[PDB]
């Protein structure tokens, strides 16, 4: 009933305001609270801050001095705003909803409660690097086969992560596999796609690969044929 | 923040503890992170879990103080693999901000899985573009730890090749891939290519020539 | 449209590194970047041309080195006739000599 | 006919029940085919066995109407994989003259076995005949599937070869060959010739060159 969304640039510059937001679909806004937690490589994951259902709002003293979070209840979107950002400011930010529960160990009358707050329901994560390296399109190369054969698509030299790849315009499905990224020491990531259909589908059911990199808008596709 | 691991045989139950123990009256959440993928929260209050997260995951309640906050996976299998968190409320101290540590859940006993070596020569394309690279994939085995090797014809080749660390598949096994990048001269002054994926005792080939 | 550096500065036996970057005109992976070392009205000099070949007589201390997306020319071991302005170029081999903003050094 | 598939682990009882069930009062012959041998008739009556069958092989009696006919093969071995079929007489229908369907029994959890393989040169007549043949000869492997690859030195040789099917031996492996043609000059003018046989996860390599 109720999903999120992220969605953000995919490169900023260091010292430079990053900016991120989430959509809500199916549920309001402005009757929940949100969070934002960003997980790095090797660090575990770090709870950035959350908001209210009447739009409060409450950082982590851990970047509590840089962190900016709000909220649009004309739609289902709330915005994240990170200035100062450095190396060490790349991961995978998440959006989810936090719901809040009452701990009552003694009289509520003396307070003595706590309240504690639980994300129920997650977004996707959206990948965010910071480098002062310029964006680049991938350049997609095809890969030609020869019980069954397989064939593929070669997507290499693009910065930075992510790609995704669908075949045929999201048609074919089942037997693709596609591969985790390869970073050269030129500074690049390099993916490779593959799917295995029957052999006497290659005359001529076409395959189409696509390619699509959000970070310089550069969508593409290419068939595969011996 | 640091981990620390846990080794569970398959079909077991796994017991992990929490990280801190709890000074007072507490409320507790468990969250299942594989890296890459989203967090799921399993148990929200301290034995309260939402739909859609099977019987097998439980939480210890706090009935007495003393108890201490245990997760609790019965049954484990291939697919609880993942860090494991463990968000701690009480009332003594204050706002639970840092998620804590994380246990790496490791379940033993997996069966062994053998590659599927598959290996593309140049494109026309690239090699019209004075480049050319060799792909070898790498996928279905477990456990995830390969080695690839390179030949020239009969003789070795390192100079140029990138390899990926083994990833998780969706099917609980692991895939990983290993690029030759090479001149287009290379390519054809040569025999052959070969690609040697050695995994666990064994080592297979594929191999790829300009014809 | 292709920017250098703002300015910079080192010590005698240290290194410098003067930087060149701009958008997919004029930069880079598809241009050749030279490197003119230029006293403020006087004859400029060549120093390195293809992106790190040094002219005839360049001390072996200048390098260059490109990256897909900015030029670097660092200048090792520093002596005193370093203090001059460098300007770097984006060029191919049928057209002009678009030139860098400017780097004091 | 038609054969429909059925896999029973290894020391369990089978279960195979007949293809067409009886209208009336029956009499059903079972039969064990391992195609290319003579059949042998296990049970003759509704449960009447001959001599030299044992008794793990049985057959349900016509009591009452109602109950299907099943034969019943109690603590499975490998030498039990084979085409079972269910001749089926009864007082409604007509003269039996089909033997049915098939039951294509494949026994699991067997012991996994690496191949012999045993690679020969060109003989001396065969080379003085103008012809050159390589042969390389693959037994005593579990699961009968392997992967046969030729080698004139380093590069790969697909051109003129000949591969066997697996086939099951008599100690319930399986063996097959693989046959390279080529002119006595190829013979003579490359260093060494391979055979690369990869069987499950590993590879094994026997070599040959003309000395």
């Known amino acids: 009933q109720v999903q999120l969304q992220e969605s953000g640039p995919g490169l900023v510059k260091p010292s430079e305001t990053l900016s991120l937001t989430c959509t809500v679909s199916?549920?309001?806004?402005?009757?929940?609270?949100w969070s934002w937690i960003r997980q790095s490589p090797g660090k575990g994951l770090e709870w950035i801050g959350y908001?209210?259902?009447?739009?409060?709002?409450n950082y982590n003293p851990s970047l509590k001095s840089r962190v900016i979070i709000s909220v649009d209840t004309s739609k289902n979107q709330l915005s994240l705003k990170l200035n100062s950002v450095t190396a060490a400011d790349s991961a995978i930010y998440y959006c989810?909803?936090?719901?809040?529960?009452?701990?009552?160990?003694?009289?509520?009358?003396?307070?003595?409660?706590?309240?504690?707050?639980?994300?129920?329901?997650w977004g996707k994560g959206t990948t965010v690097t910071v480098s002062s390296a310029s964006t680049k399109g991938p350049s997609v190369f095809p890969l030609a086969p020869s019980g069954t054969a397989a064939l593929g698509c070669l997507v290499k030299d693009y910065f930075p992560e992510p790609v995704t790849v669908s075949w045929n315009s999201g048609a074919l499905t089942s037997g693709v596999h596609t591969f985790p990224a390869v970073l050269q020491s030129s500074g690049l990531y390099s993916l490779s796609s593959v799917v295995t259909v029957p052999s006497s589908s290659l005359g001529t059911q076409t395959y189409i690969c696509n390619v699509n990199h959000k970070p310089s808008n550069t969508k593409v596709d290419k068939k595969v044929e011996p | 923040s640091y981990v620390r691991p846990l080794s569970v045989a398959l079909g077991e139950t796994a017991s992990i503890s929490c990280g801190r123990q709890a000074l007072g009256s507490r409320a507790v959440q468990w969250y299942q992170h594989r890296p890459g993928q989203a967090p799921i929260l399993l148990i929200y209050n301290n034995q309260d879990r939402p739909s859609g997260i099977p019987e097998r995951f439980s939480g210890t309640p706090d009935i007495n103080f003393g108890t201490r906050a245990t997760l609790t996976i019965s049954g484990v299998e291939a697919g609880d693999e993942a860090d494991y968190y463990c968000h701690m409320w009480d009332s003594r101290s204050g706002f639970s901000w840092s998620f804590g540590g994380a246990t790496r859940l490791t379940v033993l006993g997996q069966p062994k899985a053998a590659p599927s070596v598959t290996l593309f020569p140049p494109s026309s394309e690239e090699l019209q573009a004075n480049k050319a690279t060799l792909v070898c994939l790498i996928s279905d085995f477990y456990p995830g730890a390969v080695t690839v090797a390179w030949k020239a014809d009969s003789s070795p080749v390192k100079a140029g090749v990138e390899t990926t660390t083994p990833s998780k598949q969706s099917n609980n096994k692991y895939a990983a891939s290993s690029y030759l990048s090479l001149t287009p001269m290379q390519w054809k002054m040569h025999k052959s290519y070969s690609c040697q994926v050695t995994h666990e005792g064994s080592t297979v080939e594929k191999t790829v020539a300009p014809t | 449209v292709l920017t250098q550096s703002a300015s910079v500065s080192g010590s005698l036996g240290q290194s410098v590194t003067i930087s060149c970057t701009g958008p997919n005109s004029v930069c880079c992976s598809h241009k050749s970047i030279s490197w003119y070392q230029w006293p403020p009205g006087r004859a400029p000099t060549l120093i390195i041309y293809e992106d790190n070949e040094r002219a005839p007589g360049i001390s072996p201390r200048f390098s260059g080195y490109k990256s897909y997306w900015s030029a670097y020319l660092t200048i090792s071991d520093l002596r005193p006739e370093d203090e001059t302005t460098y300007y770097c170029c984006s060029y191919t081999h049928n057209s002009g000599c678009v030139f860098g903003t400017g780097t004091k050094v | 006919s038609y054969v429909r598939p059925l896999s029973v682990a290894l020391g369990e009882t089978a279960s195979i029940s007949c293809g067409r069930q009886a209208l009336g009062s029956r009499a059903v012959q079972w039969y064990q085919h391992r195609p290319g041998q003579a059949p042998i008739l296990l049970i003759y009556n509704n449960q009447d066995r001959p001599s030299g069958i044992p008794e793990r092989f049985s057959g349900t009696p016509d009591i009452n109407f109602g109950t299907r006919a099943t034969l019943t093969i109690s603590g499975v071995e490998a030498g039990d994989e084979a085409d079972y079929y269910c001749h089926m007489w009864d007082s409604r229908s007509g003269f039996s003259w089909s033997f049915g369907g098939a039951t294509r029994l494949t026994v699991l959890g067997q012991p996994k076995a690496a191949p012999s393989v045993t690679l020969f040169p060109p003989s001396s007549e065969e080379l003085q005949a103008n012809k050159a043949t390589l042969v390389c000869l693959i037994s005593d492997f579990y699961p009968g599937a392997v992967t046969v690859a030729w080698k004139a030195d380093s590069s790969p040789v697909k051109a003129g070869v000949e591969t066997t099917t697996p086939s099951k031996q008599s100690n319930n492996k399986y063996a097959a060959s693989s046959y390279l043609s080529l002119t006595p000059m190829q013979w003579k003018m490359h260093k060494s010739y391979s055979c690369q046989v990869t069987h499950e996860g590993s590879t094994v390599e026997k070599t040959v060159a003309p000395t």
């Open positions: 989810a909803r936090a719901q809040q529960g009452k701990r009552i160990y003694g009289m509520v009358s003396f307070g003595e409660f706590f309240y504690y707050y639980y994300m129920d329901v």
């Open positions: 199916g549920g309001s806004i402005s009757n929940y609270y």
């Open positions: 908001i209210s259902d009447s739009e409060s709002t």
